[PDB]
Amino acid sequence: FRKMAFPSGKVEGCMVQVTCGTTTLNGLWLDDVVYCPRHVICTSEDMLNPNYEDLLIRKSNHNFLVQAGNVQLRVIGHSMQNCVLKLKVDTANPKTPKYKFVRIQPGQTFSVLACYNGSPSGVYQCAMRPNFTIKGSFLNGSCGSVGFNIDYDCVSFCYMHHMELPTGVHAGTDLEGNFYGPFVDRQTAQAAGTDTTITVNVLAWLYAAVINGDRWFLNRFTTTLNDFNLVAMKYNYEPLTQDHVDILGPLSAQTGIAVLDMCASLKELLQNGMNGRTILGSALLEDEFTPFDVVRQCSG
Amino acid sequence: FRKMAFPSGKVEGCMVQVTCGTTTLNGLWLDDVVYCPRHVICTSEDMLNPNYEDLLIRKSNHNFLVQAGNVQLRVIGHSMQNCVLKLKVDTANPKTPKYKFVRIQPGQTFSVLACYNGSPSGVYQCAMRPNFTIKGSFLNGSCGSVGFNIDYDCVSFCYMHHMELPTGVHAGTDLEGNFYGPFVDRQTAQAAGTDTTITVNVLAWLYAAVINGDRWFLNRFTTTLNDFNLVAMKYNYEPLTQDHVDILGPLSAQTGIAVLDMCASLKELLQNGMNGRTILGSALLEDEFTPFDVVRQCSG
Ligand SMILES: *[C@H](O)[C@H](C[C@@H]1CCNC1=O)NC(=O)[C@H](CC(C)C)NC(=O)OCc1ccccc1
Ligand SMILES: *[C@H](O)[C@H](C[C@@H]1CCNC1=O)NC(=O)[C@H](CC(C)C)NC(=O)OCc1ccccc1
């Protein structure tokens, strides 16, 4: 059972290089609009305490160098929407896929196409942590790299990368420029909340495990929703609602294991640990597979 | 530190659907040639003990239904090269990337574009095990899905998926149709050798860990190449040669840690275990990152 990313093809043909002064980073070219982090306009000094309006006013269209591979793009318009810069260009992207912009909830997953100088380097699947960070692989220049889900032919862009934190975790925005979490595009010490495990994702993965013939963690015991949540809250697991239980229904019915019997299996792993054993070749409990990711991988 | 796959775009535009009788699977459309597993010609009954020459002789070009998205392709020629079928078609693939065919060594890594009915569903990074299997996510119809590395603009195709084994691991061929390992495209119980850990990959990942600020596993001790190998062979680790040490040189010089000091760190993890601790958020020792994968991710 592999952590699979979406095919990156449709997104690869939207990645452009954006330079403003010294600073270079990645932009997303959809229709006649390039989207990038607004901090492209900042010098290393500005990043400490920037007035973005004031900094942006000193910039004209011709200050923005947007390159797609070997072709230069002329900017005919620029605006700031929250923490993203929208550069209007002359040429609509011929490779623009059917797309929308979505703001995802904590615990949902997406594919990141990690880019450097408008050029894709690699793809991976990650989860939006309950504390609105991501544990990712982002070097300097990776900024403007985007997160996406693909439904049929439609790319849903959910994330654009802005910054790494002292923790080494990553913060960024939706494609409207609203940060996930309490974070600002400013170089100051910024605390992410205490992170919690995505309980509904872990259960989904225990169902994935059953389906793939790993059943050892299954026990005789059962439990209640309340009695479980009091174990969850102890072990910094996100509490389980009836919505979470209803979302797991397909997997419960597929394997013939009631959600609350699986919950009881989990308690004994949380209380007793793993005992040196593994589940789908993993010594830890995996929470970066949604119930939807598990069903889509198990049915293809 | 994420397990990153290559961007799949260039490979996505080469995936076609191939049907012969009832059996449907994926093909790779490069120039005027489609490549697929030869077992596309087998009925469920034939797969038990097939005479491929005899089965192929009963088939003519017009028996092979090759579809690319919504466009049908006429076959003007068919041949068997080892375990792959080469279908010559009228139309050269317009989306054919610069490509070559390579046979990789055990312990090397590649990206798999998992496909169903000629349509890409997802991408992941895996290693060719020392026993020439891969631990992958392949449902029925996934056959013909390909493994690849990307150097600059050049796709190097190394693997095509043929079969799952009783173990639940996966076997397949190079693009010339030669199986990795002792496996045959036949539905019989087939034993993979005892698998070993890719020692040079694990060391590369301990260097990745140091670079990313996780240094706890580092010890005062050192060791010798022989004294280490006698611990390696005990713990089913592939023995370490001077070639392996020379390949780790860049990472040794980058972090200022001699290979043999890292080897000594590893012994104490093999002998004492992990102690409930983690390294780059993993409770096990990771062997699916090559020294090349580590340097490319750490320099972008
Ligand atoms: C944008 O390219 C860059 C991405 C960083 C670089 C290291 N890892 C990343 O994810 N982001 C920034 O330069 C960003 C700028 C602020 C105005 C938001 N600051 C940032 O990431 O925090 C400082 C930092 C720099 C280098 C390593 C770790 C943290
Ligand atoms: C090709 O589409 C298919 C891929 C298998 C199906 C389950 N997981 C896979 O990787 N391969 C076969 O059907 C193959 C045919 C032989 C002639 C090589 N046999 C195979 O994979 O072994 C039997 C098997 C079937 C279903 C589940 C597990 C093993």
Swiss-Prot record, chains A, B:
It is found in: Host cytoplasm; Host Golgi apparatus; Host nucleus. The chain holds residues 3266 to 3565 of 7096 of the full protein. It comes from the Viruses. There is a cross-link at residues 3, 88 (Glycyl lysine isopeptide (Lys-Gly) (interchain with G-Cter in ubiquitin)). Residues 1-300 form the Peptidase C30 domain. 3CL-PRO exists as monomer and homodimer. Only the homodimer shows catalytic activity. Interacts with host FBXO22; this interaction promotes the proteasomal degradation of nsp5. Cleaves the C-terminus of replicase polyprotein at 11 sites. Recognizes substrates containing the core sequence [ILMVF]-Q-|-[SGACN]. Cleaves and inactivates human TRMT1, preventing tRNA guanine(26)-dimethylation of tRNAs. May cleave human NLRP1 in lung epithelial cells, thereby activating the NLRP1 inflammasome pathway. May cleave human GSDMD, triggering alternative GSDME-mediated epithelial cell death upon activation of the NLRP1 inflammasome, which may enhance the release interleukins 1B, 6, 16 and 18. Also able to bind an ADP-ribose-1''-phosphate (ADRP). Residues 1-300 are cytoplasmic. The active site is at residues 39, 143. Inhibited by pyridone-containing alpha-ketoamides compounds 13a and 13b. In turn, alpha-ketoamide 13b (tert-butyl (1-((S)-1-(((S)-4-(benzylamino)-3,4-dioxo-1-((S)-2-oxopyrrolidin-3-yl)butan-2-yl)amino)-3-cyclopropyl-1-oxopropan-2-yl)-2-oxo-1,2-dihydropyridin-3-yl)carbamate) inhibits SARS-CoV-2 replication in human lung cells. Inhibited ex vivo by michael acceptor inhibitor N3. Inhibited ex vivo by compound 11a and 11b. This is 3C-like proteinase nsp5. It comes from Severe acute respiratory syndrome coronavirus 2. It catalyses: TSAVLQ-|-SGFRK-NH2 and SGVTFQ-|-GKFKK the two peptides corresponding to the two self-cleavage sites of the SARS 3C-like proteinase are the two most reactive peptide substrates. The enzyme exhibits a strong preference for substrates containing Gln at P1 position and Leu at P2 position.
